[PDB]
RNA sequence: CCGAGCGCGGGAACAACCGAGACCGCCAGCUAAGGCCCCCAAGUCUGGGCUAAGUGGUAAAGGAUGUGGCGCCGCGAAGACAGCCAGGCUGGUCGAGUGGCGCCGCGCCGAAAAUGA
RNA sequence: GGGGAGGUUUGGCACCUCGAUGUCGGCUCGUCGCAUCCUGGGGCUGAAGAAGGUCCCAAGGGUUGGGCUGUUCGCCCAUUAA
RNA sequence: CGGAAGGGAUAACCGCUGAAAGCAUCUAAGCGGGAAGCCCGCCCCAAGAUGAGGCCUCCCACGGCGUCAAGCCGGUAAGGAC
């Protein structure tokens, strides 16, 4: 009968965003979020690392995105459309562009969201240093 | 490119002369050089876009040179009866058909002369900047096309 | 960014040069600044004026440790007036010269569960020809299968009034520094005896 | 073929399109179509190109010095095209390519709809 | 002569609904589209100016009251920025 | 009393400098102006923003079972409710 993990301490990580293609970056951050580089993987469980990102504001993005790419945010009401172009995003709270794109590669359940909570993002660095932080790439 | 002070750098080029000092943002993938008392700019290939980028720098530079050389200035005619212009301190006021005289404070790096109320010379180290403020002035009252009136440069009247 | 708390005392009109002026009178008792909020400690800047004189008895609270912590005879209420840091220990009508324009905040009288007719100046039915049981009704509220729902925000009847109402830009007329009065252009929310707060406008 | 295979895989979802005809069981293996950056299993695989439109993410007659690839015709180191000096093609000066047609690849415009994309 | 877009007209088809999906007009309440009537910005004009014309951009708000007809629509009266 | 002002970014459009393509061009690098519209600004809601924020202040150990561990029962504090 297949092995099954017991409780474990959560590994943390640190990433530098500068120069990273936003998506290509998200992908990994995602695959980390699910305990999915670990070989004792377990779906129903949430033993993902605790990815911490810094220098978000610097995220490279190809093509015309900045100008061209629009962020839809539907309020509840008549004409709650709300389109926000990629720049205005970074220009004001920019952590989002990254957040707003890991949430995206995370699966959908309560677990997915448990995970979105492990991920912690700042444009900085200067994240609350605490302990772990093993930088990556 | 002589008598000057060209000084390379990564993505930009410092161009110094009597007139002033100009930071002239060039392409990084181009190769600005410094042969003798002159300057070259050689191109990494023959791709459509390297050519575009090429000339554009080889001029963007020259301009910066002459920019601290003789420097730059433009000429503004102020035709039509009432129309005229008194210089005042730094900024130039100028009455031109409006019911309000237009006070135009001068951008840093710029300074303009009013040889005659009918003429206006705009002097500065910087082409682009000159050209702008120049038109920026013509703008206050573009040339009518039913009669000579308002600011011209020194080019045909539309007739 | 001046500001002082007060109470809509009442209104009458008074005569200027040679025309009548509708004025409401705010009494704006000497407001004891009671805390200040810095960009460092608080992250934003403003100032906590107190207002009514309180019984040191009913202040039995941990509230004592606030007034005490700033040596202020205990007040009844105290609101912040954002983005404005004074001096001395109290703000008074003196911030206001006659002719200055102010925005008075107040709390609209409370109409309870309000008719759509009263709440939205809706049309409602016909006193006559047609039906008789939709006289004051809102009538239609939607479409058909599409959307097949009502829009949020749809105007409907129900508890209306008794809410935070700011009426912008009234003119201060003669301010009576003596009896602590502040005269204005009348149009100021809530009933008499209500707390209100007056401030500098946005004209320019 | 569905009907009677609204049983299974793919195609987002979807009787009849693609794959395949489910006797029962398995915490074994090979495959099919379709896929192998994350949600989502398996290549952020190797090599050669093309495209800068988010094209791809799916609209026409027609239009355009988009872009790359190929073919032919015209003037050119006996000095051409481009401007600049003189005269009404001529001259010089400059000094190496220039003008037009045609066919292929990818693209551009033509392109306005009603609850939120 | 040619190519389209739209899905507001008149239709064609007969796919759900005949153990029921109430029809035109009005009222009340609207909300969306833009292919814009006004107001804002502009290009050309056979634009002197003023007024206009045609096209471009722009939904933010606005878009009157009556006569006649069940009318929608339309005509008409008096206005309007419309 | 209100529609603003104002700041910012843009639409059509107007331009500065400038190649590719000796000239020419608003553009391909770069830059300025430009809408009642976009984002701000004003007004109101708002931390169930479960991502539950911040400030100021007041009250404060264990009295008995569970062997580390989560708790359980009681009279209380500030304070709150009736
Ligand atoms: Mg009380
Ligand atoms: Mg009535
Ligand atoms: Mg009846
Ligand atoms: Mg009845
Ligand atoms: Mg629906
Ligand atoms: Mg069969
Ligand atoms: Mg995978
Ligand atoms: Mg690869
Ligand atoms: Mg590779
Ligand atoms: Mg290409
Ligand atoms: Mg043809
Ligand atoms: Mg075609
Ligand atoms: Mg072509
Ligand atoms: Mg052929
Ligand atoms: Mg009909
Ligand atoms: Mg049939
Ligand atoms: Mg039934
Ligand atoms: Mg029924
Ligand atoms: Mg029914
Ligand atoms: Mg019917
Ligand atoms: Mg016009
Ligand atoms: Mg006109
Ligand atoms: Mg006119
Ligand atoms: Mg348009
Ligand atoms: Mg339009
Ligand atoms: Mg709308
Ligand atoms: Mg409308
Ligand atoms: Mg509205
Ligand atoms: Mg009638
Ligand atoms: Mg008719
Ligand atoms: Mg040139
Ligand atoms: Mg030019
Ligand atoms: Mg939430
Ligand atoms: Mg004690
Ligand atoms: Mg004790
Ligand atoms: Mg007691
Ligand atoms: Mg007590
Ligand atoms: Mg009580």
mmCIF file with all atom_site columns, C-alpha atoms in Angstrom, chain A residues 8-137:
data_model
loop_
_atom_site.group_PDB
_atom_site.id
_atom_site.type_symbol
_atom_site.label_atom_id
_atom_site.label_alt_id
_atom_site.label_comp_id
_atom_site.label_asym_id
_atom_site.label_entity_id
_atom_site.label_seq_id
_atom_site.pdbx_PDB_ins_code
_atom_site.Cartn_x
_atom_site.Cartn_y
_atom_site.Cartn_z
_atom_site.occupancy
_atom_site.B_iso_or_equiv
_atom_site.pdbx_formal_charge
_atom_site.auth_seq_id
_atom_site.auth_comp_id
_atom_site.auth_asym_id
_atom_site.auth_atom_id
_atom_site.pdbx_PDB_model_num
ATOM 1   C CA . UNK A 1 8   ? 6.208   17.793 8.460   1.00 0.00 ? 8   UNK A CA 1
ATOM 2   C CA . UNK A 1 9   ? 7.843   21.191 8.887   1.00 0.00 ? 9   UNK A CA 1
ATOM 3   C CA . UNK A 1 10  ? 7.211   23.505 5.864   1.00 0.00 ? 10  UNK A CA 1
ATOM 4   C CA . UNK A 1 11  ? 10.313  24.430 3.864   1.00 0.00 ? 11  UNK A CA 1
ATOM 5   C CA . UNK A 1 12  ? 10.503  28.141 2.921   1.00 0.00 ? 12  UNK A CA 1
ATOM 6   C CA . UNK A 1 13  ? 12.072  29.772 -0.058  1.00 0.00 ? 13  UNK A CA 1
ATOM 7   C CA . UNK A 1 14  ? 13.037  33.177 -1.411  1.00 0.00 ? 14  UNK A CA 1
ATOM 8   C CA . UNK A 1 15  ? 12.936  34.337 -4.980  1.00 0.00 ? 15  UNK A CA 1
ATOM 9   C CA . UNK A 1 16  ? 14.093  37.417 -6.825  1.00 0.00 ? 16  UNK A CA 1
ATOM 10  C CA . UNK A 1 17  ? 11.704  38.496 -9.503  1.00 0.00 ? 17  UNK A CA 1
ATOM 11  C CA . UNK A 1 18  ? 13.794  41.045 -11.338 1.00 0.00 ? 18  UNK A CA 1
ATOM 12  C CA . UNK A 1 19  ? 14.267  39.981 -14.972 1.00 0.00 ? 19  UNK A CA 1
ATOM 13  C CA . UNK A 1 20  ? 11.860  37.057 -14.736 1.00 0.00 ? 20  UNK A CA 1
ATOM 14  C CA . UNK A 1 21  ? 9.215   36.700 -17.422 1.00 0.00 ? 21  UNK A CA 1
ATOM 15  C CA . UNK A 1 22  ? 6.143   37.049 -15.162 1.00 0.00 ? 22  UNK A CA 1
ATOM 16  C CA . UNK A 1 23  ? 4.379   33.848 -16.269 1.00 0.00 ? 23  UNK A CA 1
ATOM 17  C CA . UNK A 1 24  ? 7.423   31.624 -16.615 1.00 0.00 ? 24  UNK A CA 1
ATOM 18  C CA . UNK A 1 25  ? 8.134   32.809 -13.073 1.00 0.00 ? 25  UNK A CA 1
ATOM 19  C CA . UNK A 1 26  ? 4.631   32.111 -11.789 1.00 0.00 ? 26  UNK A CA 1
ATOM 20  C CA . UNK A 1 27  ? 4.727   28.584 -13.139 1.00 0.00 ? 27  UNK A CA 1
ATOM 21  C CA . UNK A 1 28  ? 7.562   27.551 -10.842 1.00 0.00 ? 28  UNK A CA 1
ATOM 22  C CA . UNK A 1 29  ? 6.261   29.482 -7.833  1.00 0.00 ? 29  UNK A CA 1
ATOM 23  C CA . UNK A 1 30  ? 3.149   27.462 -8.422  1.00 0.00 ? 30  UNK A CA 1
ATOM 24  C CA . UNK A 1 31  ? 4.854   24.092 -8.745  1.00 0.00 ? 31  UNK A CA 1
ATOM 25  C CA . UNK A 1 32  ? 6.547   24.905 -5.495  1.00 0.00 ? 32  UNK A CA 1
ATOM 26  C CA . UNK A 1 33  ? 3.311   25.887 -3.780  1.00 0.00 ? 33  UNK A CA 1
ATOM 27  C CA . UNK A 1 34  ? 1.998   22.349 -4.236  1.00 0.00 ? 34  UNK A CA 1
ATOM 28  C CA . UNK A 1 35  ? 4.436   20.005 -2.530  1.00 0.00 ? 35  UNK A CA 1
ATOM 29  C CA . UNK A 1 36  ? 5.126   18.768 -6.027  1.00 0.00 ? 36  UNK A CA 1
ATOM 30  C CA . UNK A 1 37  ? 8.899   18.812 -6.386  1.00 0.00 ? 37  UNK A CA 1
ATOM 31  C CA . UNK A 1 38  ? 8.933   16.605 -3.266  1.00 0.00 ? 38  UNK A CA 1
ATOM 32  C CA . UNK A 1 39  ? 8.800   12.949 -4.201  1.00 0.00 ? 39  UNK A CA 1
ATOM 33  C CA . UNK A 1 40  ? 6.409   11.977 -1.395  1.00 0.00 ? 40  UNK A CA 1
ATOM 34  C CA . UNK A 1 41  ? 3.676   14.087 -3.054  1.00 0.00 ? 41  UNK A CA 1
ATOM 35  C CA . UNK A 1 42  ? 0.170   14.032 -1.662  1.00 0.00 ? 42  UNK A CA 1
ATOM 36  C CA . UNK A 1 43  ? -2.834  15.674 -3.407  1.00 0.00 ? 43  UNK A CA 1
ATOM 37  C CA . UNK A 1 44  ? -5.246  15.925 -0.520  1.00 0.00 ? 44  UNK A CA 1
ATOM 38  C CA . UNK A 1 45  ? -2.836  17.424 1.887   1.00 0.00 ? 45  UNK A CA 1
ATOM 39  C CA . UNK A 1 46  ? -0.983  20.688 1.239   1.00 0.00 ? 46  UNK A CA 1
ATOM 40  C CA . UNK A 1 47  ? 2.625   20.218 2.151   1.00 0.00 ? 47  UNK A CA 1
ATOM 41  C CA . UNK A 1 48  ? 3.855   22.926 -0.162  1.00 0.00 ? 48  UNK A CA 1
ATOM 42  C CA . UNK A 1 49  ? 6.908   25.076 0.416   1.00 0.00 ? 49  UNK A CA 1
ATOM 43  C CA . UNK A 1 50  ? 6.332   28.622 1.612   1.00 0.00 ? 50  UNK A CA 1
ATOM 44  C CA . UNK A 1 51  ? 7.551   30.579 -1.420  1.00 0.00 ? 51  UNK A CA 1
ATOM 45  C CA . UNK A 1 52  ? 8.525   34.173 -0.664  1.00 0.00 ? 52  UNK A CA 1
ATOM 46  C CA . UNK A 1 53  ? 9.054   36.593 -3.489  1.00 0.00 ? 53  UNK A CA 1
ATOM 47  C CA . UNK A 1 54  ? 10.821  39.914 -3.656  1.00 0.00 ? 54  UNK A CA 1
ATOM 48  C CA . UNK A 1 55  ? 11.532  42.603 -6.235  1.00 0.00 ? 55  UNK A CA 1
ATOM 49  C CA . UNK A 1 56  ? 8.177   41.907 -7.789  1.00 0.00 ? 56  UNK A CA 1
ATOM 50  C CA . UNK A 1 57  ? 7.800   45.424 -9.218  1.00 0.00 ? 57  UNK A CA 1
ATOM 51  C CA . UNK A 1 58  ? 10.614  44.471 -11.574 1.00 0.00 ? 58  UNK A CA 1
ATOM 52  C CA . UNK A 1 59  ? 8.933   41.570 -13.363 1.00 0.00 ? 59  UNK A CA 1
ATOM 53  C CA . UNK A 1 60  ? 9.870   41.407 -17.010 1.00 0.00 ? 60  UNK A CA 1
ATOM 54  C CA . UNK A 1 61  ? 7.043   40.811 -19.446 1.00 0.00 ? 61  UNK A CA 1
ATOM 55  C CA . UNK A 1 62  ? 7.350   40.225 -23.192 1.00 0.00 ? 62  UNK A CA 1
ATOM 56  C CA . UNK A 1 63  ? 5.474   41.936 -26.110 1.00 0.00 ? 63  UNK A CA 1
ATOM 57  C CA . UNK A 1 64  ? 3.398   45.100 -25.589 1.00 0.00 ? 64  UNK A CA 1
ATOM 58  C CA . UNK A 1 65  ? 1.701   43.614 -22.462 1.00 0.00 ? 65  UNK A CA 1
ATOM 59  C CA . UNK A 1 66  ? 2.236   46.542 -20.147 1.00 0.00 ? 66  UNK A CA 1
ATOM 60  C CA . UNK A 1 67  ? 0.087   48.740 -22.418 1.00 0.00 ? 67  UNK A CA 1
ATOM 61  C CA . UNK A 1 68  ? -1.986  46.075 -24.177 1.00 0.00 ? 68  UNK A CA 1
ATOM 62  C CA . UNK A 1 69  ? -2.855  43.644 -21.363 1.00 0.00 ? 69  UNK A CA 1
ATOM 63  C CA . UNK A 1 70  ? -6.024  44.431 -19.406 1.00 0.00 ? 70  UNK A CA 1
ATOM 64  C CA . UNK A 1 71  ? -7.133  43.132 -16.042 1.00 0.00 ? 71  UNK A CA 1
ATOM 65  C CA . UNK A 1 72  ? -10.925 42.568 -15.733 1.00 0.00 ? 72  UNK A CA 1
ATOM 66  C CA . UNK A 1 73  ? -12.403 42.991 -12.247 1.00 0.00 ? 73  UNK A CA 1
ATOM 67  C CA . UNK A 1 74  ? -16.230 42.622 -12.244 1.00 0.00 ? 74  UNK A CA 1
ATOM 68  C CA . UNK A 1 75  ? -17.914 44.437 -9.359  1.00 0.00 ? 75  UNK A CA 1
ATOM 69  C CA . UNK A 1 76  ? -21.456 43.309 -8.622  1.00 0.00 ? 76  UNK A CA 1
ATOM 70  C CA . UNK A 1 77  ? -23.376 46.121 -10.298 1.00 0.00 ? 77  UNK A CA 1
ATOM 71  C CA . UNK A 1 78  ? -24.675 47.556 -13.594 1.00 0.00 ? 78  UNK A CA 1
ATOM 72  C CA . UNK A 1 79  ? -21.584 48.410 -15.607 1.00 0.00 ? 79  UNK A CA 1
ATOM 73  C CA . UNK A 1 80  ? -19.240 47.076 -12.938 1.00 0.00 ? 80  UNK A CA 1
ATOM 74  C CA . UNK A 1 81  ? -16.896 46.214 -15.827 1.00 0.00 ? 81  UNK A CA 1
ATOM 75  C CA . UNK A 1 82  ? -13.627 47.628 -14.388 1.00 0.00 ? 82  UNK A CA 1
ATOM 76  C CA . UNK A 1 83  ? -10.732 47.068 -16.801 1.00 0.00 ? 83  UNK A CA 1
ATOM 77  C CA . UNK A 1 84  ? -7.260  47.745 -15.444 1.00 0.00 ? 84  UNK A CA 1
ATOM 78  C CA . UNK A 1 85  ? -4.312  47.741 -17.882 1.00 0.00 ? 85  UNK A CA 1
ATOM 79  C CA . UNK A 1 86  ? -1.076  45.951 -16.852 1.00 0.00 ? 86  UNK A CA 1
ATOM 80  C CA . UNK A 1 87  ? 0.857   49.178 -16.133 1.00 0.00 ? 87  UNK A CA 1
ATOM 81  C CA . UNK A 1 88  ? -1.593  50.919 -13.830 1.00 0.00 ? 88  UNK A CA 1
ATOM 82  C CA . UNK A 1 89  ? -1.294  47.688 -11.855 1.00 0.00 ? 89  UNK A CA 1
ATOM 83  C CA . UNK A 1 90  ? 2.455   47.819 -11.199 1.00 0.00 ? 90  UNK A CA 1
ATOM 84  C CA . UNK A 1 91  ? 2.345   51.583 -10.963 1.00 0.00 ? 91  UNK A CA 1
ATOM 85  C CA . UNK A 1 92  ? -0.002  51.266 -8.029  1.00 0.00 ? 92  UNK A CA 1
ATOM 86  C CA . UNK A 1 93  ? 0.053   48.018 -5.958  1.00 0.00 ? 93  UNK A CA 1
ATOM 87  C CA . UNK A 1 94  ? 2.241   45.720 -8.198  1.00 0.00 ? 94  UNK A CA 1
ATOM 88  C CA . UNK A 1 95  ? 2.622   42.694 -5.973  1.00 0.00 ? 95  UNK A CA 1
ATOM 89  C CA . UNK A 1 96  ? -0.673  41.836 -7.505  1.00 0.00 ? 96  UNK A CA 1
ATOM 90  C CA . UNK A 1 97  ? 0.459   41.149 -11.072 1.00 0.00 ? 97  UNK A CA 1
ATOM 91  C CA . UNK A 1 98  ? 2.400   38.204 -9.633  1.00 0.00 ? 98  UNK A CA 1
ATOM 92  C CA . UNK A 1 99  ? -0.242  37.167 -7.064  1.00 0.00 ? 99  UNK A CA 1
ATOM 93  C CA . UNK A 1 100 ? -2.917  37.608 -9.730  1.00 0.00 ? 100 UNK A CA 1
ATOM 94  C CA . UNK A 1 101 ? -1.087  34.949 -11.752 1.00 0.00 ? 101 UNK A CA 1
ATOM 95  C CA . UNK A 1 102 ? -0.113  32.317 -9.230  1.00 0.00 ? 102 UNK A CA 1
ATOM 96  C CA . UNK A 1 103 ? -3.662  32.202 -7.914  1.00 0.00 ? 103 UNK A CA 1
ATOM 97  C CA . UNK A 1 104 ? -4.237  31.423 -11.561 1.00 0.00 ? 104 UNK A CA 1
ATOM 98  C CA . UNK A 1 105 ? -1.970  28.348 -11.782 1.00 0.00 ? 105 UNK A CA 1
ATOM 99  C CA . UNK A 1 106 ? -3.090  27.080 -8.417  1.00 0.00 ? 106 UNK A CA 1
ATOM 100 C CA . UNK A 1 107 ? -5.995  24.614 -8.590  1.00 0.00 ? 107 UNK A CA 1
ATOM 101 C CA . UNK A 1 108 ? -9.462  25.734 -7.563  1.00 0.00 ? 108 UNK A CA 1
ATOM 102 C CA . UNK A 1 109 ? -10.598 24.046 -4.332  1.00 0.00 ? 109 UNK A CA 1
ATOM 103 C CA . UNK A 1 110 ? -10.170 25.016 -0.635  1.00 0.00 ? 110 UNK A CA 1
ATOM 104 C CA . UNK A 1 111 ? -6.723  23.477 -0.961  1.00 0.00 ? 111 UNK A CA 1
ATOM 105 C CA . UNK A 1 112 ? -5.783  25.643 -3.883  1.00 0.00 ? 112 UNK A CA 1
ATOM 106 C CA . UNK A 1 113 ? -6.571  28.598 -1.635  1.00 0.00 ? 113 UNK A CA 1
ATOM 107 C CA . UNK A 1 114 ? -4.875  27.081 1.388   1.00 0.00 ? 114 UNK A CA 1
ATOM 108 C CA . UNK A 1 115 ? -1.867  27.159 -0.914  1.00 0.00 ? 115 UNK A CA 1
ATOM 109 C CA . UNK A 1 116 ? -2.341  30.658 -2.189  1.00 0.00 ? 116 UNK A CA 1
ATOM 110 C CA . UNK A 1 117 ? -1.834  31.571 1.453   1.00 0.00 ? 117 UNK A CA 1
ATOM 111 C CA . UNK A 1 118 ? 1.619   29.912 1.656   1.00 0.00 ? 118 UNK A CA 1
ATOM 112 C CA . UNK A 1 119 ? 2.890   32.238 -1.148  1.00 0.00 ? 119 UNK A CA 1
ATOM 113 C CA . UNK A 1 120 ? 3.999   35.658 0.166   1.00 0.00 ? 120 UNK A CA 1
ATOM 114 C CA . UNK A 1 121 ? 4.888   38.570 -2.117  1.00 0.00 ? 121 UNK A CA 1
ATOM 115 C CA . UNK A 1 122 ? 6.523   41.970 -1.851  1.00 0.00 ? 122 UNK A CA 1
ATOM 116 C CA . UNK A 1 123 ? 8.332   44.257 -4.232  1.00 0.00 ? 123 UNK A CA 1
ATOM 117 C CA . UNK A 1 124 ? 11.398  45.116 -2.175  1.00 0.00 ? 124 UNK A CA 1
ATOM 118 C CA . UNK A 1 125 ? 13.217  43.003 -0.979  1.00 0.00 ? 125 UNK A CA 1
ATOM 119 C CA . UNK A 1 126 ? 12.948  43.467 2.783   1.00 0.00 ? 126 UNK A CA 1
ATOM 120 C CA . UNK A 1 127 ? 10.421  40.699 3.374   1.00 0.00 ? 127 UNK A CA 1
ATOM 121 C CA . UNK A 1 128 ? 9.913   39.908 7.063   1.00 0.00 ? 128 UNK A CA 1
ATOM 122 C CA . UNK A 1 129 ? 13.149  37.997 7.620   1.00 0.00 ? 129 UNK A CA 1
ATOM 123 C CA . UNK A 1 130 ? 12.363  35.268 10.087  1.00 0.00 ? 130 UNK A CA 1
ATOM 124 C CA . UNK A 1 131 ? 14.330  32.181 9.595   1.00 0.00 ? 131 UNK A CA 1
ATOM 125 C CA . UNK A 1 132 ? 14.260  30.175 6.443   1.00 0.00 ? 132 UNK A CA 1
ATOM 126 C CA . UNK A 1 133 ? 14.698  31.953 3.161   1.00 0.00 ? 133 UNK A CA 1
ATOM 127 C CA . UNK A 1 134 ? 16.831  29.528 1.129   1.00 0.00 ? 134 UNK A CA 1
ATOM 128 C CA . UNK A 1 135 ? 17.053  31.653 -2.004  1.00 0.00 ? 135 UNK A CA 1
ATOM 129 C CA . UNK A 1 136 ? 16.304  29.803 -5.268  1.00 0.00 ? 136 UNK A CA 1
ATOM 130 C CA . UNK A 1 137 ? 16.135  30.558 -9.032  1.00 0.00 ? 137 UNK A CA 1
#
